[PDB]
């Protein structure tokens, strides 16, 4: 149950 | 035992190993993902600084 | 000599240390992510508020 980021590149809120 | 528990135990160690490799990958992804957010943050701070000169 | 087999056994022991240590780390990332997003949003809020006659939001 290790988790990575939501997606490979950062997207600001 | 022989057929055996041992065999299952070995597989169970193999899962542990791929689980380690997975976690190490996901942590690396987080590092890069975070480094980019820091680039955004620094830009945000540069923006605020400039914006605050018009408040002067 | 199981000395070669024995050494293999604790490398496995170490592997499950490094594993345990990676998951604790991965957990730390998750909380850190949550804290940084709060930070970014606050910075965004500062900008929004600061944007005095240089920009305009909430526009239908």
Swiss-Prot record, chain A:
<comment type="function">
    <text>(Microbial infection) Involved in HIV-1 virus budding. Can replace TSG101 it its role of supporting HIV-1 release; this function requires the interaction with CHMP4B. The ESCRT machinery also functions in topologically equivalent membrane fission events, such as enveloped virus budding (HIV-1 and other lentiviruses).</text>
</comment>
<comment type="subunit">
    <text>Self-associates. Interacts with SH3KBP1/CIN85. Interacts with PDCD6 in a calcium -dependent manner. Interacts with TSG101 in a calcium-dependent manner; PDCD6IP homooligomerization may be required for TSG101-binding. Interacts with SGSM3. Directly interacts with CHMP4A, CHMP4B and CHMP4C. Directly interacts with CEP55 in a 1:2 stoechiometry. The interaction with CEP55 is required for PDCD6IP targeting to the midbody. May interact with PDGFRB. Interacts with SH3GL1 and SH3GL2/endophilin-1. Forms a complex with SDCBP and SDC2. Found in a complex with F-actin, TJP1/ZO-1 and PARD3.</text>
</comment>
<comment type="subunit">
    <text>(Microbial infection) Interacts with HIV-1 p6. Interacts with HIV-1 p9.</text>
</comment>
<feature type="compositionally biased region" description="Pro residues">
    <location>
        <begin position="1"/>
        <end position="13"/>
    </location>
</feature>
<protein>
    <recommendedName>
        <fullName>Programmed cell death 6-interacting protein</fullName>
    </recommendedName>
</protein>
<comment type="function">
    <text>Multifunctional protein involved in endocytosis, multivesicular body biogenesis, membrane repair, cytokinesis, apoptosis and maintenance of tight junction integrity. Class E VPS protein involved in concentration and sorting of cargo proteins of the multivesicular body (MVB) for incorporation into intralumenal vesicles (ILVs) that are generated by invagination and scission from the limiting membrane of the endosome. Binds to the phospholipid lysobisphosphatidic acid (LBPA) which is abundant in MVBs internal membranes.</text>
</comment>
<feature type="region of interest" description="Interaction with CEP55">
    <location>
        <begin position="5"/>
        <end position="10"/>
    </location>
</feature>
Swiss-Prot record, chain B:
<feature type="region of interest" description="Interaction with TSG101">
    <location>
        <begin position="6"/>
        <end position="56"/>
    </location>
</feature>
<comment type="function">
    <text>Plays a role in mitotic exit and cytokinesis. Recruits PDCD6IP and TSG101 to midbody during cytokinesis. Required for successful completion of cytokinesis. Not required for microtubule nucleation. Plays a role in the development of the brain and kidney.</text>
</comment>
<feature type="region of interest" description="Interaction with PDCD6IP">
    <location>
        <begin position="6"/>
        <end position="56"/>
    </location>
</feature>
<protein>
    <recommendedName>
        <fullName>Centrosomal protein of 55 kDa</fullName>
    </recommendedName>
</protein>
<comment type="subunit">
    <text>Homodimer. Interacts with AKAP9/CG-NAP; the interaction occurs in interphase and is lost upon mitotic entry. Interacts with PCNT/Kendrin; the interaction occurs in interphase and is lost upon mitotic entry.</text>
</comment>
Swiss-Prot record, chain C:
<feature type="region of interest" description="Interaction with PDCD6IP">
    <location>
        <begin position="5"/>
        <end position="59"/>
    </location>
</feature>
<comment type="function">
    <text>Plays a role in mitotic exit and cytokinesis. Recruits PDCD6IP and TSG101 to midbody during cytokinesis. Required for successful completion of cytokinesis. Not required for microtubule nucleation. Plays a role in the development of the brain and kidney.</text>
</comment>
<comment type="subunit">
    <text>Homodimer. Interacts with AKAP9/CG-NAP; the interaction occurs in interphase and is lost upon mitotic entry. Interacts with PCNT/Kendrin; the interaction occurs in interphase and is lost upon mitotic entry.</text>
</comment>
<feature type="region of interest" description="Interaction with TSG101">
    <location>
        <begin position="5"/>
        <end position="60"/>
    </location>
</feature>
<protein>
    <recommendedName>
        <fullName>Centrosomal protein of 55 kDa</fullName>
    </recommendedName>
</protein>
């Amino acid at each position: 149950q290790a988790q990575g980021p939501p997606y490979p590149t950062y997207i600001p809120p | 035992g022989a057929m055996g528990s041992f065999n299952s135990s070995i597989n169970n160690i193999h899962e542990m190993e791929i689980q380690l490799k997975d976690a190490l990958e996901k942590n690396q992804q987080w590092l890069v993902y975070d480094q980019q957010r820091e680039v955004y943050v620094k830009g945000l701070l540069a923006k605020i600084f400039e914006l605050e000169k018009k408040t002067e």
